[PDB]
Amino acid sequence: KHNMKAFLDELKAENIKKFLYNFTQIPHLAGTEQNFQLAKQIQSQWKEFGLDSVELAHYDVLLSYPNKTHPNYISIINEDGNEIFNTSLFEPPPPGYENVSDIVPPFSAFSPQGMPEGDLVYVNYARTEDFFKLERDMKINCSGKIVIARYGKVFRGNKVKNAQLAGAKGVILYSDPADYFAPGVKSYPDGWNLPGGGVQRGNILNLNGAGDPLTPGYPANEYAYRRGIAEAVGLPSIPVHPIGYYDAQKLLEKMGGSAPPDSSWRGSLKVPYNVGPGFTGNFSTQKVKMHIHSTNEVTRIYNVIGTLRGAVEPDRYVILGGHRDSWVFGGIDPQSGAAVVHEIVRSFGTLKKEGWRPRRTILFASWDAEEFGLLGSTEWAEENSRLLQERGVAYINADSSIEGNYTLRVDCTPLMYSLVHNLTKELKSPDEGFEGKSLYESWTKKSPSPEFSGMPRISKLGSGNDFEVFFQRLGIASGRARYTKNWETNKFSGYPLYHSVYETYELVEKFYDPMFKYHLTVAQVRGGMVFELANSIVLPFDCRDYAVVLRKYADKIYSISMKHPQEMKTYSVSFDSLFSAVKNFTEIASKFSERLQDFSNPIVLRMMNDQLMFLERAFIDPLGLPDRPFYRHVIYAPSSHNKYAGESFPGIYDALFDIESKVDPSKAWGEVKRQIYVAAFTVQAAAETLSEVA
Amino acid sequence: KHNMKAFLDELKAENIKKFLYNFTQIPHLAGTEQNFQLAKQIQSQWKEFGLDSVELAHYDVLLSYPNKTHPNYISIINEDGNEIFNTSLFEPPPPGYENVSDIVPPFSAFSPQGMPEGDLVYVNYARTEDFFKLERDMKINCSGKIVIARYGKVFRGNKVKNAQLAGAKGVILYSDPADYFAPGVKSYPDGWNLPGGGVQRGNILNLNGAGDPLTPGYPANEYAYRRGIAEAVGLPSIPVHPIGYYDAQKLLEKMGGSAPPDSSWRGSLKVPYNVGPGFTGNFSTQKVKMHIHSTNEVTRIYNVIGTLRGAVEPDRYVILGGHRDSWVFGGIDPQSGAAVVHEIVRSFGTLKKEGWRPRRTILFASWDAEEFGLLGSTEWAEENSRLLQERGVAYINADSSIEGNYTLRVDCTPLMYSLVHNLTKELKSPDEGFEGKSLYESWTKKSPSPEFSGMPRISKLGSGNDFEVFFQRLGIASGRARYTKNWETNKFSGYPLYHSVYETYELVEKFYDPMFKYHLTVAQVRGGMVFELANSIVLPFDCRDYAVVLRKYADKIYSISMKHPQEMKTYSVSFDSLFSAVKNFTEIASKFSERLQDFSNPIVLRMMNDQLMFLERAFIDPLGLPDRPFYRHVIYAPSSHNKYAGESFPGIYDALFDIESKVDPSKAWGEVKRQIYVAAFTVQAAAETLSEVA
Numbered sequence A, B: 001k002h003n004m005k006a007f008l009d010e011l012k013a014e015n016i017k018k019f020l021y022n023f024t025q026i027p028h029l030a031g032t033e034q035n036f037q038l039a040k041q042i043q044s045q046w047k048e049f050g051l052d053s054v055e056l057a058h059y060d061v062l063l064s065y066p067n068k069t070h071p072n073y074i075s076i077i078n079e080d081g082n083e084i085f086n087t088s089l090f091e092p093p094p095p096g097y098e099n100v101s102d103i104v105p106p107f108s109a110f111s112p113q114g115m116p117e118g119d120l121v122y123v124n125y126a127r128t129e130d131f132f133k134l135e136r137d138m139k140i141n142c143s144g145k146i147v148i149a150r151y152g153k154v155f156r157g158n159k160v161k162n163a164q165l166a167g168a169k170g171v172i173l174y175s176d177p178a179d180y181f182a183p184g185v186k187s188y189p190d191g192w193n194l195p196g197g198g199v200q201r202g203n204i205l206n207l208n209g210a211g212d213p214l215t216p217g218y219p220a221n222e223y224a225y226r227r228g229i230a231e232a233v234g235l236p237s238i239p240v241h242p243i244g245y246y247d248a249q250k251l252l253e254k255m256g257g258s259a260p261p262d263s264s265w266r267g268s269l270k271v272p273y274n275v276g277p278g279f280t281g282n283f284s285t286q287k288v289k290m291h292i293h294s295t296n297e298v299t300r301i302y303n304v305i306g307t308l309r310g311a312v313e314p315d316r317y318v319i320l321g322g323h324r325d326s327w328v329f330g331g332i333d334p335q336s337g338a339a340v341v342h343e344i345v346r347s348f349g350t351l352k353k354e355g356w357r358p359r360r361t362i363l364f365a366s367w368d369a370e371e372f373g374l375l376g377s378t379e380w381a382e383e384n385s386r387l388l389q390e391r392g393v394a395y396i397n398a399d400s401s402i403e404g405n406y407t408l409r410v411d412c413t414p415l416m417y418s419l420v421h422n423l424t425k426e427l428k429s430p431d432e433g434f435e436g437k438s439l440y441e442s443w444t445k446k447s448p449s450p451e452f453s454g455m456p457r458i459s460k461l462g463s464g465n466d467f468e469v470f471f472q473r474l475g476i477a478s479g480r481a482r483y484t485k486n487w488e489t490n491k492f493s494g495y496p497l498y499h500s501v502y503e504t505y506e507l508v509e510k511f512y513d514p515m516f517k518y519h520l521t522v523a524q525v526r527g528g529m530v531f532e533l534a535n536s537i538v539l540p541f542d543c544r545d546y547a548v549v550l551r552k553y554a555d556k557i558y559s560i561s562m563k564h565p566q567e568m569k570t571y572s573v574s575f576d577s578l579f580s581a582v583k584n585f586t587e588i589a590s591k592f593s594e595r596l597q598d599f600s601n602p603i604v605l606r607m608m609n610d611q612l613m614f615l616e617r618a619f620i621d622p623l624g625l626p627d628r629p630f631y632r633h634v635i636y637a638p639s640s641h642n643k644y645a646g647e648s649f650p651g652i653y654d655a656l657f658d659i660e661s662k663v664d665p666s667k668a669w670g671e672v673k674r675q676i677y678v679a680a681f682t683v684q685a686a687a688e689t690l691s692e693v694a
């Protein structure tokens, strides 16, 4: 038989191991020849594996690279302008790779050039609330200062945006052992911890969904008109550079001024964590000087797009997509995901050779330039937005398969909650002490839902990965699944070796997943989701699960507003319309489910499948969110304070944010109420797409 | 049999006569009780006629009315401030109606209140080019002046916008016998000509598609948040009032300053047509004073929405829509269209009673508040935009069935060209001297295509009617058809009695269509289009007709650019990408047509029907056009100089408009090229929706 079990059994941990090894021997930096070579290899193998067609889609996008002959670094500069301390020019390469060429040294992609010098202020994680604490409570002024912030908690671009708006003239990012060194485990190469010479790369753009900075709205094709650099989307206006904790120790040890406001501001280094500004009296004339010479350049990138035509509904598209470009070797990020995708393709191609075709078309993507702002996925979706809008059933992402070995981590639309619960009950757990138990049982046990008993946690979709354009801009049902670690508050932080040269094949084979059984579990979850979305006669979405979270989000937003009862009186701020819309959505969803259960008629079915397919679509507002035209989903958006985090009713949330500080409370509360109207309307409108059609 | 002939034969000219009589006995001004009464009657009759459901959809929108106890008028004011001439407070009511109450006196809907006084400048039609001539060539300054403009050529809101941006402090609109009095025919009641006391009402908003000024983007429902009046969309900032040609004679006769630049500036009045500013020396201290006291008020309006459920594709919608509200009696505008719609409904309901159902759902609409800015249609489409987007096959408008009795007038998307040619070859001509001839033959003879031999003219869609939100904002294939007059350059002018109290049932029965045979022909064209769209197994759209006009529009835009060969060299302005996209669209369209001809498979069919249905949709850009977010169609938009006229490649057209006058030619030409990219891309993207789907 050709059913899901046949698909699933054909997947092998050994194949995923081999692919991972193969994809991680050299660096595959976006825009470089070696990543073009690997694109061509993936394209050739997906053809060999059986796909009906496999093409490269290329674009010319703004990327960013250090100057090879003019290295970036930071100095402590004495009063005569002698540079008495220099941060490192590279990370000490790992054993056996100390002769790899073309390892990009640590840098912040899209930093402007500059050599600012001044006094340090230490800003903790550089969160919105950390700047509130500094400026509001401690009355510390970041204007003309160089901020040094620790990585963790939030997306690094938000930190740089927050620093810039506090008036900083430069940002230094470092990894603190508090966030990137787990107690009792050894530094790479002898464990999975970050060495003091290890550095996290990453871009620091604030694109808000735009894709290529130069071509918002439209694919960066051969005839594209490009914005001038000065009108580019999302570029930081101050120099930024990242460092390891040996270098950071050196920069923080001398710091004076005010003490840390409390213990949540202290990392694990044997330094005071003085906020500053500047150094203690003896070194008070010493300054910090950045040297940043990176350049932004329009560079060609390549997505691999494979197509497996559907037997019955070829004009319906289930997309499995993940990136191929890496900072250096990509041993976790992304090749542990890409190797899983390669084996999924192999498996579907095995059944295809035996004469099987999925019911719907499956599209497989190897995205380029994810690391530089989701550029490959976005430009491709901009080019194909009409097809995706009218034909896109679902998008399953496939970045890093593992970031730990503790339990499953799922972020998806409520429309896939049931699909995921059901599939995980059919899969074996690979965890120790759950042999013979389902993945559902181990996941639910290790990662319990905060609201429901005997349910696992599933999180909301924000941004920080290639699903973003499909879900947030286009409104296509999206999901992702990976293995993760226990470490609670380290959620948006990363694993220790994230974006460092130390992220290697050996890292994975030795310390994460020696048997490739977590990878295999992840391939079963991703591939199984895709198989069901692509082959189930009725789309496997439960609209009633959306009704349930909509009420939870309404309760939550209402409780946030209700911290301001006097203003809700004065300005007549009612949530009645939103709760009404949610009630209607619940009732109408329930009736649709009855009909879906209660109908040999392919038109009713497809009509009903179209209703299911367009329900996620219905949450899109074509006017987008305020000042964020590419974030169009009214229920979810990437948090304005942390793009990695999903926020619910983002328009009302931001209208309420820090409202007690607004100068015109009438205008601010009027906007809260505008946003309530927009959300109530959109919920009601999405509900009506599920009513009888005529 | 239940086929199109059965539908068509069931339509009767006598029924349309009776409905017209019934709809035109009292005024039906948007927002008044009598128009709510008529909505309820239409709703009751459409139920009696057989529709599956018939509902009222109501909204609270910004409307505008004169103050009943404080009438609007204009004065010539002497130097002591004595008002020595007063324009009329009402039009002399027609025979037999001189006791009708509730006849709204002439006014410009949405004029702000004011009593400006100053000197006249006469601005011809107040077109963009007439202001160019005045200011550029004649060096006449409209700043602080009261402009008097003649109606005709362009939408009155454009005139008021043009006057406002020339710095005018008030606008006076009048009807000139040159434009509104045909040689050799008698004034109402003894002919169809405009009397000197007759006045054209109409709003003067510049909404650019927004709908209700207070709620752009969202339906003006019960919980809507409304913009403050000061942020309202499209409101004029200077007082405006319209007058008849007796009153205008009085205002123009004394005018001095500069003479008319040429004979195209002279109407038919026995006056000099001096541009001014001000009066000739003897009356040089006399001024013109406006008295405007109209108020803008949020007022409830009612659409009637009737549904005839489809037998096979109930989730596909063919819409026949036209307005019900009138300035006064609406004898032509709109009740001659609305009576045609009523009889179409009756006929489809006749077949429905005999057990027939169309293949697709047909929706029938009686829109409210069209006269005040397409408010009813727009708010309904804003409310239902997700259903319309994913399910809307086509929209057929149904305003005035006749504006003359010479020949057929069709404006539609290229996607309906073939449908229209074929249907008209099957219909009898009602024209004198074409008895036994097809409507196609008489129409083609009287209204030849400028490019093709033995083809009729079909025009492009702009705005100025209820199809606007469906086509320009949403991208649903749209069409309209009516009988019209010969009078060439009187195209966007109107017939003489347009928007005057004199537009009565008797006007029609006596001077336009005594046998109701033009009405009947129009009902056959509108109803027949709807019947085919709703019942043909393959949607009756020919994508190849779009390929043909796209090349014509590209040639045209390119020729406009080529008036500036030096700048096209200097700035490297190439149209290659646009011609390339058009070539691809042509080739891909041709192949799609072959497949459409060449496939018992309902999935391939519907897949193919979805491709046809989404092709118009593909021309929408979700970023909209520059500063006009509700005009989203890239191929067509209402002309920025005349909203009644469709423009092709409007983004490039406006980027090129008056470009030789721009201060930064590099920036202006850079924008031309941006717009070329946007159009080439969108054409290519629409072509790819017609490629094999996988």
Ligand SMILES: *[C@@H]1O[C@H](CO)[C@@H](O[C@@H]2O[C@H](CO)[C@@H](O[C@@H]3O[C@H](CO)[C@@H](O)[C@H](O[C@H]4O[C@H](CO)[C@@H](O)[C@H](O)[C@@H]4O)[C@@H]3O)[C@H](O)[C@H]2NC(C)=O)[C@H](O)[C@H]1NC(C)=O
Pocket: A577, A578, A580, A581, A584, A680, A681, A684, B222
């Ligand atoms: C959830 O679904 C329900 C449908 O079951 C829907 O209920 C609708 O609510 C609206 C808003 O309350 C109702 O609107 C009323 O409509 C009647 C005519 O049907 C009008 O006369 C009412 O206006 C008068 O009263 C108002 C309120 O006191 C005054 O402000 C106003 O000036 C008038 O005097 C009013 O417009 C509508 O009838 C129901 N429809 C039903 C029950 O079928 C509800 O709105 C949905 N929720 C959301 C958020 O969409």
Ligand SMILES: *[C@@H]1O[C@H](CO)[C@@H](O[C@@H]2O[C@H](CO)[C@@H](O[C@@H]3O[C@H](CO)[C@@H](O)[C@H](O[C@H]4O[C@H](CO)[C@@H](O)[C@H](O)[C@@H]4O)[C@@H]3O)[C@H](O)[C@H]2NC(C)=O)[C@H](O)[C@H]1NC(C)=O
Pocket: A222, B577, B578, B580, B581, B584, B680, B681, B684
């Ligand atoms: C109409 O349809 C045709 C498809 O038949 C489509 O043709 C495509 O045109 C693009 C743009 O010319 C071609 O792009 C080239 O692609 C190759 C790889 O396939 C690249 O190597 C090329 O880049 C080099 O050359 C450029 C031009 O001299 C340089 O600027 C560049 O730096 C590189 O050196 C180039 O990107 C594409 O291959 C074809 N596709 C085909 C024939 O299948 C055409 O674009 C469509 N028209 C529109 C408006 O979409």
Ligand SMILES: *[C@@H]1O[C@H](CO)[C@@H](O[C@@H]2O[C@H](CO)[C@@H](O)[C@H](O)[C@H]2NC(C)=O)[C@H](O)[C@H]1NC(C)=O
Pocket: A021, A022, A023, A025, A026, A040, A041, A044, A045
């Ligand atoms: C990764 O695996 C690929 C595919 O097997 C290897 O590429 C092949 O290598 C052989 C030997 O050079 C050639 O004959 C083929 O042309 C390659 N096939 C392709 C590109 O499809 C590749 O060498 C492996 N890379 C590493 C680092 O082991």
Ligand SMILES: *[C@@H]1O[C@H](CO)[C@@H](O[C@@H]2O[C@H](CO)[C@@H](O)[C@H](O)[C@H]2NC(C)=O)[C@H](O)[C@H]1NC(C)=O
Pocket: A075, A081, A082, A083, A084, A085, A086
């Ligand atoms: C940090 O790096 C700088 C730059 O390479 C070093 O300063 C340079 O030293 C050379 C040789 O002595 C001089 O000729 C240059 O003028 C210096 N460049 C400067 C000041 O920009 C500096 O020695 C390094 N600091 C440490 C502690 O190694």
Ligand SMILES: *[C@@H]1O[C@H](CO)[C@@H](O[C@@H]2O[C@H](CO)[C@@H](O)[C@H](O)[C@H]2NC(C)=O)[C@H](O)[C@H]1NC(C)=O
Pocket: A418, A419, A422, A540, A541, A542, A597
């Ligand atoms: C997950 O599985 C549950 C249990 O099988 C599915 O719910 C059943 O679906 C069948 C088929 O329609 C119904 O007859 C049962 O009544 C359902 N049982 C319930 C609701 O407890 C559910 O549909 C699955 N979810 C998917 C496929 O998304």
Ligand SMILES: *[C@@H]1O[C@H](CO)[C@@H](O[C@@H]2O[C@H](CO)[C@@H](O)[C@H](O)[C@H]2NC(C)=O)[C@H](O)[C@H]1NC(C)=O
Pocket: B021, B022, B023, B025, B026, B040, B041, B044, B045
């Ligand atoms: C227009 O025609 C309608 C429908 O026949 C007439 O309305 C009906 O009038 C009779 C007599 O008053 C009533 O019994 C019905 O209640 C009405 N039916 C409806 C509203 O469906 C209406 O009187 C006619 N109007 C004019 C001006 O002739």
Ligand SMILES: *[C@@H]1O[C@H](CO)[C@@H](O[C@@H]2O[C@H](CO)[C@@H](O)[C@H](O)[C@H]2NC(C)=O)[C@H](O)[C@H]1NC(C)=O
Pocket: B075, B081, B082, B083, B084, B085, B086
């Ligand atoms: C035009 O209308 C105005 C306003 O009705 C007339 O002037 C008014 O005349 C009355 C009675 O004589 C005065 O008490 C008011 O003070 C006047 N109103 C003004 C000047 O605003 C005027 O007579 C009319 N002009 C003509 C020629 O009929």
Ligand SMILES: *[C@@H]1O[C@H](CO)[C@@H](O[C@@H]2O[C@H](CO)[C@@H](O)[C@H](O)[C@H]2NC(C)=O)[C@H](O)[C@H]1NC(C)=O
Pocket: B418, B419, B422, B540, B541, B542, B597
């Ligand atoms: C208008 O009528 C023409 C002539 O009948 C239709 O074109 C024919 O369509 C049939 C059925 O597919 C083909 O077999 C013929 O080859 C076509 N003849 C041509 C192109 O000359 C055309 O499809 C009609 N247009 C519609 C229905 O939109």
Ligand SMILES: *[C@@H]1O[C@H](CO)[C@@H](O)[C@H](O)[C@H]1NC(C)=O
Pocket: A067, A068, A069, A070, A293, A295
């Ligand atoms: C790298 O360093 C210097 C800076 O002037 C110079 O040799 C070269 O232009 C730089 N490369 C760039 C800016 O791409």
Ligand SMILES: *[C@@H]1O[C@H](CO)[C@@H](O)[C@H](O)[C@H]1NC(C)=O
Pocket: A141, A142, A143, A144
């Ligand atoms: C912060 O300090 C700088 C010093 O010049 C100043 O420009 C800025 O206004 C200060 N901000 C405030 C208001 O504390």
Ligand SMILES: *[C@@H]1O[C@H](CO)[C@@H](O)[C@H](O)[C@H]1NC(C)=O
Pocket: A192, A404, A405, A485, A511, A512
């Ligand atoms: C894998 O699991 C074991 C058991 O808890 C743990 O000691 C080890 O640290 C895990 N690997 C990683 C990278 O977390």
Ligand SMILES: *[C@@H]1O[C@H](CO)[C@@H](O)[C@H](O)[C@H]1NC(C)=O
Pocket: B067, B068, B069, B070, B293, B295
């Ligand atoms: C009509 O005229 C006067 C103007 O002050 C007054 O009686 C009344 O308020 C007006 N009505 C309005 C402004 O609606």
Ligand SMILES: *[C@@H]1O[C@H](CO)[C@@H](O)[C@H](O)[C@H]1NC(C)=O
Pocket: B141, B142, B143, B144
């Ligand atoms: C037109 O005349 C007015 C008179 O005050 C003036 O304000 C305006 O600048 C003039 N426009 C020009 C530049 O001719």
Ligand SMILES: *[C@@H]1O[C@H](CO)[C@@H](O)[C@H](O)[C@H]1NC(C)=O
Pocket: B192, B404, B405, B485, B511, B512
């Ligand atoms: C109707 O047609 C006749 C014949 O040409 C013409 O004289 C008459 O003016 C027409 N009616 C109108 C309103 O044009």
Ligand SMILES: N[C@@H](COS(=O)(=O)O)C(=O)O
Pocket: A202, A203, A370, A371, A372, A373, A374, A463, A464, A465, A643
């Ligand atoms: N995955 C990336 C790039 O994502 S984003 O910056 O483009 O959101 C990272 O977190 O660095």
Ligand SMILES: N[C@@H](COS(=O)(=O)O)C(=O)O
Pocket: B202, B203, B370, B371, B372, B373, B374, B463, B464, B465, B643
């Ligand atoms: N049909 C109308 C209202 O149209 S528009 O002003 O809203 O475009 C008229 O021309 O007056």
